[PDB]
């Protein structure tokens, strides 16, 4: 886990987890609340937060459609997942600016 392991991208299992914006993983592989980094190539890394759902088969990670479009992930493709640790003394966020629009026209 800490070193990094190969995983298979999957589809988000439930709408609630899709709205949670957290990658869905299996309990046997990780735990809820843990943050990971997903590598798709040498210059392509993305940080995600994990949530555990029973329906996820071991050895695969599920992402919602927005996550796949943002990270350029394709279902069935291989990725590298490595446990990620935050520096809370510095990386704790105070303010975010977010551009919001209607999801559906």
């Amino acid at each position: 886990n800490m070193a990094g392991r190969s995983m298979q991208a999957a589809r988000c299992p439930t709408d609630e987890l899709s709205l949670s914006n957290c990658a869905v993983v299996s309990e046997k592989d990780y735990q809820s609340g843990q943050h990971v980094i997903v590598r798709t190539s040498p210059n392509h890394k993305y940080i995600f937060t994990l949530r555990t759902h029973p329906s996820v088969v071991p050895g695969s990670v599920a992402f919602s459609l927005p996550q796949r479009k943002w990270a350029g992930l394709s279902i069935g493709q291989e990725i590298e997942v490595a446990l990620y640790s935050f520096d809370k003394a510095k990386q704790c966020i105070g303010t975010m600016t977010i551009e919001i629009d209607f999801l559906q026209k």
Partner: protein, 534 residues
């Protein structure tokens, strides 16, 4: 090296030319300052000619006028190149005689204690040009140079004359006017760098800072940073537009316009004015044009498979090598594939993501009806404009439409092919960089022409070749819902397809005008005809 006189250029109104001025003065004016005594004891004659070349708007005439005023002299005359040819013999000779007359009169009246009479030409690459050798179709025959040559040096020569010539095309000047004894010093004025832009901006906003008409949030370093490949005559236009924007807020519209007279007491120029003027008004001519990334990348770029990422990764490595390598200043690449596979959009995206300050596209859309003799000139000009920048990028679209290739015979242009073969292996001057991209759909023909030994590498843009990739593309476009997606996958997933992205979009658009219960069958009917077996 040479100990130079100490000047300050903030009081003269010139910025960035800290070396051209020095050498010009040393080689053309360091002997007109000394007293005539030592000049006679040395017997040293005077330089009576200078040539200046560079892109427009970079401050050549300003330098000539300032130099003329520095050495107390009369108001310099002025002439134009193409103007003098508007007439024929018996009319232009009188015009020539009407320039040096005062100099001759003063030389007669005074002798060796006269005053310098500067003369300023313009576009001197027209009269002094027999170079009609270019282009299969071009002819020139002129005799206007010889009278000027005779006047400059020879019989009844004048010791109190000085001719300064200016041009934008240094390679069209005849070599008869450059020999030692007539136009002997040469200089180039180029685009300024960041320090020069800072100096120019500090010079052009000095009369408002005196009267406290400049706000406190206006920082000039950021303005210098944000204006890349700007001339000296466009920073002035930027300041003028930023001034005219602020004077509009203090006008009241009535039967006849008049000033506010109450909010006109705090007339200040703000950062907002400068930012708005940079977004709307000024458009540099050696900068990136952002109106050409909406006509080519029309429907974005979606990731339908693995091959759509290798291309982008390879394009990034080539950009990072044309910017960080010193053993390879010029690189080339060719994008190839079957028709409708999406080659122009990817090249445009790579160019846009490059981030270079100069980006240009050469397309056959702008040359409808042209002959080859004009296509060569257009392409050569597009390439010439790219050597004035320290980082460039040029795209060449539809290489097979430039040569006029038709399979019957076959036919093509052998005057464009050779020029294109020679321009792909010519490096830029000094230490400047360059990157060329090119898109084609017929690689075998290009191979038979020995045109693949000019490029450095190649990239293959493939078609959709599996059911899973087609389903992924449909899901990403988001047009057919799950009920119909299952039906589509129950049939397509059992075979292999051969379809481009452009054709897929066309088919999806065509099969959406039918009634809601026939669309899924119409789509498959169209797909079967277009491609279902390679």
């Amino acid at each position: 090296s040479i100990i130079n006189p100490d000047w300050n250029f903030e009081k003269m109104g010139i910025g960035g030319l800290d070396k051209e001025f020095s050498d010009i003065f040393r080689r053309a004016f360091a002997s007109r300052v000394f007293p005539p005594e030592i000049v006679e004891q040395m017997g040293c004659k005077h330089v009576k000619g200078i040539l200046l070349y560079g892109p427009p708007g970079c401050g050549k005439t300003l330098l000539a006028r300032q130099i003329g005023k520095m050495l107390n002299a009369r108001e310099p005359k002025v002439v134009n190149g193409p103007e003098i040819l508007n007439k024929y013999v018996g009319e232009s000779e009188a015009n020539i005689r009407k320039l040096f007359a005062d100099a001759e009169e003063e030389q007669r009246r005074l002798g060796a204690n006269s005053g310098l009479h500067i003369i300023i030409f313009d576009e001197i690459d027209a009269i002094c040009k027999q170079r009609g050798s270019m282009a299969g179709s071009t002819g020139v025959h002129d005799t206007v140079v010889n009278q000027l040559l005779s006047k400059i040096d020879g019989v009844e020569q004048l010791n109190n004359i000085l001719v300064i010539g200016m041009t934008n095309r240094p390679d069209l000047i005849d070599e008869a006017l450059l020999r030692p004894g007539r136009l002997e010093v040469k200089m180039e004025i180029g685009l300024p760098d960041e320090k020069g832009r800072l100096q120019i901006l500090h010079i052009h906003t000095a009369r408002m800072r005196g009267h406290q008409l400049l706000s406190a949030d206006v920082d000039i370093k950021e303005l210098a940073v944000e204006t890349k490949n700007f001339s000296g005559a466009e920073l002035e236009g930027l300041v003028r537009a930023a001034q005219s924007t602020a004077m509009n807020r203090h006008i009241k519209a009535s039967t006849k316009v008049e000033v506010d007279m109450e909010k006109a007491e705090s007339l200040q120029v703000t950062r907002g004015d400068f930012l708005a003027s940079l977004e709307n008004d000024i458009k540099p001519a050696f900068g990136t044009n952002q109106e050409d990334y909406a006509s080519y990348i029309m429907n974005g770029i979606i990731k339908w498979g693995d091959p759509v990422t290798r291309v982008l990764d390879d394009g990034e490595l080539l950009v990072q090598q044309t910017k960080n390598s010193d053993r390879t200043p010029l690189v080339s690449v060719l994008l190839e594939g079957p028709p409708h596979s999406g080659k122009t959009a990817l090249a445009a995206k790579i160019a846009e993501e490059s981030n270079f300050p100069f980006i240009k596209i050469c397309s056959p859309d702008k040359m409808i009806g042209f002959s080859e003799t004009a296509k060569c000139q257009a392409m050569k000009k597009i390439f010439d404009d790219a050597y004035k920048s320290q980082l460039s990028c040029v795209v060449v679209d539809d290489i097979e439409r430039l040569l006029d290739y038709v399979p019957i015979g076959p036919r093509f242009s052998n005057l464009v092919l050779q020029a294109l073969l020679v321009l792909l292996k010519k490096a830029p001057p000094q230490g400047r960089k360059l990157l060329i991209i090119g898109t084609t759909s017929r690689k075998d023909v290009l191979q038979e022409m020995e045109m693949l030994n000019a490029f450095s590498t190649t990239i293959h843009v493939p078609n959709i070749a599996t059911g899973e990739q087609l389903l992924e593309a449909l899901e990403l476009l988001g047009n057919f819902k799950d009920k119909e997606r299952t039906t589509i996958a129950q049939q397509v997933k059992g075979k292999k397809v051969w379809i481009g992205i452009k054709k897929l979009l066309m088919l999806i658009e065509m099969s959406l005008q039918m009634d809601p219960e026939y669309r899924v069958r119409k789509f498959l009917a169209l797909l079967r005809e277009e491609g279902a077996s390679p």
